[PDB]
Amino acid sequence: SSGLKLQFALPHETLYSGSEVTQVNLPAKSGRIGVLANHVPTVEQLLPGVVEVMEGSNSKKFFISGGFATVQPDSQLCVTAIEAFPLESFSQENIKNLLAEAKKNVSSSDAREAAEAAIQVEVLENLQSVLK
Amino acid sequence: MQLVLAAKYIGAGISTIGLLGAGIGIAIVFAALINGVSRNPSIKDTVFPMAILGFALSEATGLFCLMVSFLLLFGV
Amino acid sequence: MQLVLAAKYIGAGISTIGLLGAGIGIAIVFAALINGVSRNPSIKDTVFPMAILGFALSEATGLFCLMVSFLLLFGV
Amino acid sequence: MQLVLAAKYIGAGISTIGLLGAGIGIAIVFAALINGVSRNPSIKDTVFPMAILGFALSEATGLFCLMVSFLLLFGV
Amino acid sequence: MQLVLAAKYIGAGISTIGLLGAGIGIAIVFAALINGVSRNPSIKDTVFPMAILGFALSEATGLFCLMVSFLLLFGV
Amino acid sequence: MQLVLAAKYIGAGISTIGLLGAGIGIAIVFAALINGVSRNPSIKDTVFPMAILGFALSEATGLFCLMVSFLLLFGV
Amino acid sequence: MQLVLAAKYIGAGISTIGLLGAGIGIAIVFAALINGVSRNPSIKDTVFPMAILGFALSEATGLFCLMVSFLLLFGV
Amino acid sequence: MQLVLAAKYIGAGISTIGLLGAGIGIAIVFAALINGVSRNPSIKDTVFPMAILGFALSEATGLFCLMVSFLLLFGV
Amino acid sequence: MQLVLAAKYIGAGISTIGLLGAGIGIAIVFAALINGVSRNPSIKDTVFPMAILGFALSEATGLFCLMVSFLLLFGV
Amino acid sequence: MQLVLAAKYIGAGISTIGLLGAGIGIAIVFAALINGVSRNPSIKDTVFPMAILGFALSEATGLFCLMVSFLLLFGV
Amino acid sequence: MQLVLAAKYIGAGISTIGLLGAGIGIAIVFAALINGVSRNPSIKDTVFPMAILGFALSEATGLFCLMVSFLLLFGV
Amino acid sequence: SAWRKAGISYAAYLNVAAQAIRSSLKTELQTASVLNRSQTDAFYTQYKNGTAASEPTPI
């Protein structure tokens, strides 16, 4: 058995399924993690960050919403999330600031709704660093 | 003067023991920066600058005990 | 005076050993701030200020033992 | 008196070694507060007050050994 | 008496080194309470009381070695 | 007797250094109980009793070295 | 005999320093049993027996260095 | 012979300090077996045998420094 | 020769202190192998061989300081 | 000159103790790079360069205490 | 020459204490490679080479302090 | 900013990020598939042991 089979799927669309990958970089609660061919079976919670599937050829990088990641004993990593995001040609700085700024005003609004605003701030700030 | 001169060398070799705080101390402070970026590659130009600040703080113990040796060999 | 003068240098080189508490001590206190901000970039202007407070607390051992050396070389 | 006077300086430089407990000790106690708030920003006005309590407990070793040096230089 | 009197000060400055067990010791015991209330704020009136019990246990080394210094300066 | 009497005080101040094993030792043993209940409060009347057993084991080093000081001050 | 007798007390107070291995040593060995049950209480009558075995192994350093003190005070 | 005989006792009490490597050393090696089987009871007859092998390796420092004391008390 | 002969025993008992690096050193290196296979039973014939390599590297400090004692007792 | 010359060798053997900060210090700093790359292979040409920077910082304690020995053997 | 010759052996037995940095130091550096590949056996020909680099860095303290002993026994 | 304290389940924690992301992109590359993917008109009602019920509310 050479390589590791990746299974990156979503509740609306499936990207990778039993596909061999050289390396993957997905943010974890404990901290940023990396995986290669043979990797010790670890089960960590994925936080709203950025994942990058590596290949012998140029590797593509997509933004992830969050979920779980588990590396099966048989050398098989499984990534589960909600929504996905392409390189940068998909997101727009202008489209982000609009809501982003409105989030700070949600703290001003009733706390019941401001609770979700705090969670948005984080995700939004990370979107800016993706611009690179 | 001979008995008091000999104490100048004995006291200088002991003041070097106080420099362990800078060897192991600065080690831990710098080691945290290495283990931090492995957990959060995003934040770099924020932890790096403060990391250097911790250096001068831990370098203190490596300067005071260092001056004590010169005040017993080239000072007195 | 010669025998008692020699003890002034021997005692000064040993009082530097007590400065290890400031080298390794301040190291751990500062290292925690590095491990903290690399796990939670949100809370910065809250842990940073208190981190400095821990500095002066651990700097104590680096001042007392530091004064003892001067009270044996430039004091007595 | 000369032989006994010299022992006053030698004993004072060694009593500073006992102050390491306050340098590294208070460091760990304060470091825990830094690693606690970076992992649990919610609880602050609960761990902060008790953290200070641990300071006075670890500051003990930094006071006793500190007084011993004065009882050999400005005391006896 | 002069030679034996001088040994009273030398032995008193060394008995302070044994107080490190209370500085770093109590530090770890108290630090655990800080690390414990950060991952589980629920259990407080259960770990806090026992934490104090560990204090008196580690304070022992800070009392015995403390009495030894008085038995060489204000005792003998 | 004077030269041999002076060695009774010097040897007593050094035997206190061996009491560090009880300060830091008992600290770690007790600290584990704190970090343990914070991870699993279910098991209390099982780890608490054994924790005390570890106390008497680590208290040994704090008794032997403690008796050595009395055998040089109030013994000999 | 007086000069050689005095060395019997000085050497006895230093042999107590070797007992630190039993204070901190047994501490870590016993501490592992505490942190191990907090993660998996299923295995108790398996780790507990072996834990005691580690005690006698680490108690060695606390016996040899302990006998050395008696061979200088009540032996020689 | 008297001055050289006294050095036989002073050197024997210091060679016991080298036995700390066996107290704390064997402690860590044995402690790993305790934290290991807990996290994974599946592997026992594989880590247990090798664990004993590490004992004899760390027991070395507890034998050499142990023989040095006999070569100064019952040897020379 | 008598004064220089006595220094042969005093220097031999101190060279044993340098053997702590092999007691605690080899302990950590071997302890990692225990905490490695308990979390990854798969890999064994890969970490085991390299683990032994680390032994000879840490055994160095336990050989050099060991030879120094023989060069003062059965050498010189 | 003979009594003061002898203190040149005694003080040189003690200044080597201050080199522990470079042995254990650089160890921790380098060890972090090993635990970092095994957790995040991506960030290599970022942590590797800074890791070397920490080397020269911790190598300081291994140079100062190293020069002190030459200023007592081939210097003075 | 006799009084100065005796200091050659006393200073040689103390310079061995500085070799602890290589025993425990290299231990931690090598131990990281064991724990690192236990969580990611794939990466091997990347951490293994750098691991050896850390060896020569920590071996420094085990060479300098090693040469100091020869400059007091077979040098001077 | 605690989510598991006074926020919501982990399912909701990733939910807020799913809509924030899907709404952080271009308005041109935003198919109707994503629009209705963030739209819902379901209301919940708590019932008693006697067929009773509580005032209806939006999910």
Tab-separated table of C-alpha atoms in Angstrom, chain A residues 7-113:
chain	number	residue	atom	x	y	z
A	7	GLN	CA	-11.996	11.472	1.040
A	8	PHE	CA	-12.937	15.145	0.995
A	9	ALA	CA	-16.734	15.463	0.756
A	10	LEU	CA	-19.503	17.948	1.605
A	11	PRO	CA	-23.297	17.821	2.264
A	12	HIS	CA	-23.795	19.234	-1.243
A	13	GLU	CA	-20.751	18.205	-3.273
A	14	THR	CA	-17.990	15.593	-3.109
A	15	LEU	CA	-14.475	16.559	-4.247
A	16	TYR	CA	-12.026	13.736	-3.497
A	17	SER	CA	-13.045	10.091	-2.993
A	18	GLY	CA	-10.469	7.323	-2.576
A	19	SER	CA	-7.854	9.505	-4.280
A	20	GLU	CA	-4.135	9.184	-3.475
A	21	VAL	CA	-2.489	12.285	-2.069
A	22	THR	CA	1.102	13.221	-1.296
A	23	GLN	CA	0.448	15.756	1.491
A	24	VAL	CA	-2.405	17.707	3.114
A	25	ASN	CA	-2.531	20.704	5.434
A	26	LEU	CA	-5.693	21.233	7.459
A	27	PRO	CA	-6.058	23.449	10.574
A	28	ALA	CA	-6.895	21.554	13.798
A	29	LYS	CA	-8.103	22.622	17.262
A	30	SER	CA	-4.819	21.585	18.815
A	31	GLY	CA	-3.111	23.466	15.979
A	32	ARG	CA	-2.082	23.224	12.330
A	33	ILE	CA	-1.512	19.626	11.226
A	34	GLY	CA	0.087	17.891	8.260
A	35	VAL	CA	-0.267	14.400	6.854
A	36	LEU	CA	1.670	12.275	4.383
A	37	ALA	CA	1.665	8.709	3.068
A	38	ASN	CA	1.939	6.737	6.314
A	39	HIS	CA	0.564	8.670	9.261
A	40	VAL	CA	-0.464	7.698	12.790
A	41	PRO	CA	-4.252	7.374	13.253
A	42	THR	CA	-5.385	10.712	14.720
A	43	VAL	CA	-8.902	12.144	15.174
A	44	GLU	CA	-8.994	15.924	15.515
A	45	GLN	CA	-11.658	18.605	15.153
A	46	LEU	CA	-11.202	20.942	12.179
A	47	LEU	CA	-11.599	24.673	12.772
A	48	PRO	CA	-12.631	27.352	10.217
A	49	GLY	CA	-9.339	27.708	8.337
A	50	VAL	CA	-7.608	26.788	5.084
A	51	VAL	CA	-6.835	23.344	3.658
A	52	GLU	CA	-4.412	22.502	0.852
A	53	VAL	CA	-4.204	19.232	-1.023
A	54	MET	CA	-0.709	18.602	-2.324
A	55	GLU	CA	0.252	16.617	-5.414
A	56	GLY	CA	3.444	15.907	-7.347
A	57	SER	CA	2.133	18.660	-9.594
A	58	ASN	CA	1.226	22.114	-8.276
A	59	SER	CA	-1.090	21.729	-5.275
A	60	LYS	CA	-4.481	23.452	-5.031
A	61	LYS	CA	-5.696	25.227	-1.905
A	62	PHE	CA	-9.321	25.603	-0.789
A	63	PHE	CA	-10.871	27.358	2.235
A	64	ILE	CA	-12.757	25.093	4.642
A	65	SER	CA	-15.720	25.870	6.913
A	66	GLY	CA	-14.952	23.240	9.547
A	67	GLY	CA	-15.673	19.709	10.753
A	68	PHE	CA	-13.646	16.619	11.670
A	69	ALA	CA	-10.567	14.865	10.272
A	70	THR	CA	-9.694	11.225	10.867
A	71	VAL	CA	-6.733	9.241	9.576
A	72	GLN	CA	-7.711	5.589	9.279
A	73	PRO	CA	-5.161	2.929	10.365
A	74	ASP	CA	-5.079	1.655	6.787
A	75	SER	CA	-3.584	5.016	5.698
A	76	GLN	CA	-6.808	6.809	4.743
A	77	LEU	CA	-7.588	10.398	5.761
A	78	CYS	CA	-11.237	11.520	5.717
A	79	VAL	CA	-12.149	15.228	5.637
A	80	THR	CA	-15.724	16.252	6.452
A	81	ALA	CA	-17.029	19.821	6.264
A	82	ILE	CA	-19.980	21.960	5.184
A	83	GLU	CA	-19.112	24.543	2.523
A	84	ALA	CA	-15.980	24.917	0.386
A	85	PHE	CA	-14.139	27.822	-1.228
A	86	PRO	CA	-11.809	27.933	-4.291
A	87	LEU	CA	-8.467	29.747	-4.455
A	88	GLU	CA	-9.229	33.468	-4.448
A	89	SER	CA	-11.046	33.944	-7.752
A	90	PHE	CA	-14.224	33.109	-5.834
A	91	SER	CA	-14.133	35.447	-2.819
A	92	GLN	CA	-14.078	39.237	-3.032
A	93	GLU	CA	-12.643	41.701	-0.534
A	94	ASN	CA	-15.499	44.128	-1.162
A	95	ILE	CA	-18.152	41.467	-0.574
A	96	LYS	CA	-16.560	40.582	2.779
A	97	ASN	CA	-16.070	44.014	4.345
A	98	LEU	CA	-19.768	44.748	3.828
A	99	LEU	CA	-20.916	42.028	6.240
A	100	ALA	CA	-17.702	42.062	8.290
A	101	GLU	CA	-18.279	45.631	9.440
A	102	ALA	CA	-21.956	44.831	10.035
A	103	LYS	CA	-20.802	42.124	12.458
A	104	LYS	CA	-19.253	44.631	14.851
A	105	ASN	CA	-22.660	46.287	14.891
A	106	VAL	CA	-24.224	42.953	15.871
A	107	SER	CA	-22.495	43.193	19.240
A	108	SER	CA	-24.394	46.495	19.469
A	109	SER	CA	-27.617	44.614	18.658
A	110	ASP	CA	-29.236	42.244	21.187
A	111	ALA	CA	-26.835	39.650	22.674
A	112	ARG	CA	-28.971	36.730	21.466
A	113	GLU	CA	-27.881	37.731	17.954
